[PDB]
């Protein structure tokens, strides 16, 4: 039992990353207790796109990835294979062959402020859609127009990143939502992460 995974750190972290700079944690070699995935009892959406959660703590994989970020309430449905929108296209893209889980819970009490919590960003403008499981943290003026922007944000030259201004009085569709998506990489290697030895 003294090989517990760092899930209790990724779910309970006091600082989640922005969706455009989502944080990836590599769970490498330790006992994967998938039954402790109830840190926040009212999970808004705990949806597994692969093995069922009942059978989750039984399979053995070679690597686990935990991609953690914070998005809007109505933008949670975009964390799914084959979705469109700002998050899926320019911020975080999940492949249609995704094997893993998506765990999103409301965090209005944590990631909101009375004056507006302008600490979470998202990429509003991008030249082309993101490929699955690849990131883009560059802050370069998006040339919507045709005249060269010359690196100056003006007419037809937009800064690509816009801030989620989170406030506690928002509706549940505009309130902060912390999302951790677990991707279970099973590869041609010995399966390090295993289920509890119960």
């Amino acid at each position: 039992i003294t090989n517990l995974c760092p899930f209790d750190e990724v779910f309970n972290a006091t600082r989640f990353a922005s969706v455009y700079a989502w944080n990836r944690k590599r769970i490498s070699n330790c006992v994967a207790d998938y039954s402790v995935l109830y840190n926040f009892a009212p999970f808004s959406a705990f949806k597994c796109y692969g093995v069922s959660p009942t059978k989750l703590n039984d399979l053995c994989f070679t690597n686990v990835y935990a991609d953690s970020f914070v998005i809007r309430g109505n933008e949670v449905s975009q964390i799914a294979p084959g979705q469109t929108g700002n998050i899926a296209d320019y911020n975080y893209k999940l492949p249609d062959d995704f094997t893993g889980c998506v765990i999103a819970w409301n965090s209005n009490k944590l990631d909101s402020k009375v004056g507006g919590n302008y600490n979470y960003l998202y990429r509003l403008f991008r030249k082309s859609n993101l490929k699955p499981f690849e990131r883009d943290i560059s802050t370069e003026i998006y040339q919507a127009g045709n005249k060269p922007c010359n690196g100056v944000a003006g007419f037809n030259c937009y800064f690509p990143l816009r801030s989620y201004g989170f406030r506690p009085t928002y509706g549940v569709g505009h309130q902060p939502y912390r999302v951790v998506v677990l991707s279970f990489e099973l590869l041609h290697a010995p399966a390090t992460v295993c289920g509890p030895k119960k």
Binding site: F125, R162, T169, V172
Partner: protein
């Protein structure tokens, strides 16, 4: 590479920025209105100034997209809404002059007082203190004094102000590619780009009149009955053959004949349905009233209220150490923030107003999914009509009998529906001629058939004919009678109320046909009818994304403003008035005047 996609990207940026700043401004305004203090005023002004500056910057940025090559109705409509120049098209001197003229008129109307030469310490403002004289007094001479003094001290002093206002606003409209400021106001209904649903700015003029020639019989019979009920109150002062004197209407300008109910009540012995005593005996509070309102809205099929609405809204007066505005309002702060501001008491009127305001909020929730610029009613008359049909269906005896306020033993004798319809007609159909005539006069003044030499001469000439109201004193050109009203000297269109009144009954009759109603229209309750709720929601969720003709067709089934539902609503009252008007002249002769 094309303007249509650069415009889309610009709108994508503008939607988010505008939503953020608008939410900040609305939150500041709400914090002021519920917590009247000193620093809240500065917060509200700063937020409003920031919002206005951002709106002006985005408006001047949106001019670079010609809108001619944008073959997408949604983007074109959003840019057209965002591209309006407004007062920023004239010279700075002329714009400053117009702003000063508007502010002076607004302040002098707000600070309007009455001077009594008999006693200098008898100053009264338009605040209800003067309103009891024009709404409850039974003295011809006192009412005449109040009317004449108000038209002499405020009306006479707003003549050159309005005279220069007309010229400045006409210049603004002509610089804004409109033949008139009246054309500017009529542009709130213009629809172009979509085939079959096109509707012209001038097409309003021939429609509002076309739906008014069918109002003349019912309003004429109502006027005849009201007149017949005023010779007994005012002997030898009404002249049955003649018109109604202007200062005896139960209101300062005769907008609503609501206060005439106590004088022209059909059956005095029978009373009105007043469940105030029942709902104060059953230990009801504001929270219970709003819970019943959302129960009604869920029963009809619409979604219930947001969880944040119950904790953020102010439903009961906090007046222990605080101040607020008593006006019941519905607030759409943006980003899923919906609130209701009213000092609700245990009263039937508060029940109906809660239903009306929560209908406003339900409409806001319905079109909350649309982009920021398209988050409004399909035209200026849909918010108020949608809110009003809720109170229309809430006040029926079969709804109060269901919720328990009216005990399930009430007998609806046919003498009581006559009282109810007459009370409601003194407010609903008693304002249509006044609204139509005032808006027509103001349109004619703006466009130019009425010269400044004949501003008064036409105003009463219309008032003696369209609405059948005769002045008691021969006002000269010095006076400005149609400037004393609140809406006229405040940059507010007034045909909105006419269109709202017609849309109210159109929507009500449509949702009754969807609810399998059987009897008369005035006994309709659309509760527990998911069909009516779905039919209404189809139009509610559209917002401005579709032409108002299409939205009206989404519920009514006809893409034009029709008056027949209104006449169907008052049909029993119309029959009773026709029977009751025997042995009494129906109509009026303009060739009479009390002063002569």
């Amino acid at each position: 590479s094309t303007i249509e996609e650069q415009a889309k990207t610009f709108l994508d940026k503008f939607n988010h920025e505008a939503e953020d700043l608008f939410y900040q401004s609305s939150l500041a305004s709400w914090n002021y209105n519920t917590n009247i203090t000193e620093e809240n005023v500065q917060n509200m002004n700063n937020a409003g100034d920031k919002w206005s500056a951002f709106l002006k910057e985005q408006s001047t940025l949106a001019q670079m997209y010609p809108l001619q090559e944008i073959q997408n109705l949604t983007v074109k409509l959003q840019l057209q809404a965002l591209q309006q120049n407004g007062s920023s098209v004239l010279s700075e001197d002329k714009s400053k002059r117009l702003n000063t003229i508007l502010n002076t008129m607004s302040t002098i109307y707000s600070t309007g007082k009455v001077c009594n030469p008999d006693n200098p310490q008898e100053c009264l403002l338009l605040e209800p203190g003067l309103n009891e004289i024009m709404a409850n007094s039974l003295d011809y001479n006192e009412r005449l004094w109040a009317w004449e003094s108000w038209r002499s001290e405020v009306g006479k002093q707003l003549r050159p102000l309005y005279e220069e206002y007309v010229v400045l606003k006409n210049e603004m409209a002509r610089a804004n590619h409109y033949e008139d400021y009246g054309d500017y106001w009529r542009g709130d209904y213009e629809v172009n780009g979509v085939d079959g649903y096109d509707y012209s700015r001038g097409q309003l003029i021939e429609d509002v009149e076309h739906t008014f020639e069918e109002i003349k019989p019912l309003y004429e019979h109502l006027h005849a009955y009201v007149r017949a009920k005023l010779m007994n109150a005012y002997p030898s002062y009404i002249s049955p053959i003649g018109c109604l004197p202007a200062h005896l209407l139960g209101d300062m300008w005769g907008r609503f004949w609501t206060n005439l109910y106590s004088l022209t009540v059909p059956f005095g012995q029978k009373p009105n349905i007043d469940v105030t005593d029942a709902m104060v005996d059953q230990a009801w509070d504001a929270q219970r009233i709003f819970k019943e309102a959302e129960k009604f809205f869920v029963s009809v099929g619409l979604p219930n209220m947001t969880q944040g609405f119950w904790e953020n809204s102010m439903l009961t007066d906090p007046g222990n150490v605080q101040k607020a505005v008593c006006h019941p309002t519905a607030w759409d702060l943006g980003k899923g923030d919906f609130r209701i501001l009213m000092c609700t008491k245990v009263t039937m009127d508060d029940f109906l107003t809660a239903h009306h305001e929560m209908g406003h909020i339900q409409y806001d929730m319905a079109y909350a999914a649309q982009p920021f610029l398209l988050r409004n009613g399909a035209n200026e008359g849909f918010h108020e009509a949608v809110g009003e049909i809720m109170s229309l269906s809430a006040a029926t005896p079969k709804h109060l009998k269901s919720i328990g306020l009216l005990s399930p033993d009430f007998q609806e004798d046919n003498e009581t529906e006559i009282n109810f319809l007459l009370k409601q007609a003194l407010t609903i159909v008693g304002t249509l001629p006044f609204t139509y005539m005032l808006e027509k006069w103001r349109w004619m003044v703006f466009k130019g058939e009425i010269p400044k030499d004949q501003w008064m001469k036409k105003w009463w000439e219309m008032k003696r004919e369209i609405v059948g109201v005769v002045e008691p004193v021969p006002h000269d050109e010095t006076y400005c009678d149609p400037a004393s009203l609140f809406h006229v000297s405040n940059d507010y269109s007034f045909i909105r109320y006419y269109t709202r009144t017609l849309y109210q009954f159109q929507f009500q009759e449509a949702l009754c046909q969807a609810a399998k109603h059987e009897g008369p229209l005035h006994k309709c309750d659309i509760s527990n009818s998911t069909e009516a709720g779905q039919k209404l929601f189809n139009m509610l969720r559209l917002g401005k994304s579709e032409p108002w003709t299409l939205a009206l067709e989404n519920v009514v089934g006809a893409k034009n403003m029709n008056v027949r539902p209104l006449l169907n609503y008052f049909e029993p009252l119309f029959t009773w008035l026709k029977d009751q008007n025997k042995n009494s002249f129906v109509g009026w002769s303009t060739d009479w005047s009390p002063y002569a």
